[PDB]
Amino acid sequence: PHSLRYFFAGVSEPSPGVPQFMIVGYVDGDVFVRYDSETRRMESRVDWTSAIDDQQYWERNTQIAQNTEQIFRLDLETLRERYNQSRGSHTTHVMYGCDILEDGSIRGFEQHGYDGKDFLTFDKDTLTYTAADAGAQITKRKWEQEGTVAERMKYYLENTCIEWLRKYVSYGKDVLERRERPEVRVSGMEADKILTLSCRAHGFYPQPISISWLKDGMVQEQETRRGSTVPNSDGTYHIWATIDVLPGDGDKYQCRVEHASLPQPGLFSW
């Protein structure tokens, strides 16, 4: 699949490492642009963006970012009052973007959050917003009565977003399509009469991966767990998986790693 996503977050007051307003854009799960609140400019975060050669591209994104920054300040004040909340560090969130699936079909998303909770969700195929609570209903009615909000978003998600996603996937292809094979280590530690085997895959790219266990060459799902995939500092990824086995049986088990860098899933032993 392919994906373009923009994430926006505002907070009533900053704190260490937390700006008042932020925007980050992702192509196929990798950051490619980010707002700089100090210079008030959208900036590249990956080198292949030099291939975006349209004039005024950065200026246009920067203008949208600055407008949205002002809107987010207004929304925080509006929603504090609508929900009869005390003053404090409240948050507000927007995510939107589009997907191109394996069969070429498309999906589009626009979701709004307030204070860490769902607020509004867009359904482009019915041109309506779903409100999470009675307070969000007030915005639903405002937007559905303006009469052009849903139509403009649906057009963006089905046309503009998809057109730019196809361009970004082509500009970024040598980075996005590279394959890094993980370094895999299987280890074991025993406690309370149980040998826990850990299989750790270090430094794989791209992000999707599947880990399973084989016992004497057979699939074994009993007593298995896995961590969420997490990033390294260089843009590759990391994951762990474990299985509980009988002490003395460690040699019977293999970690099985399904990953695009492995044409055939790799097998690893402790």
Partner: peptide, 9 residues
């Protein structure tokens, strides 16, 4: 590219 200016809530 980003969507040009969402409405206020």
């Amino acid at each position: 590219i980003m969507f040009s200016n969402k409405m206020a809530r």
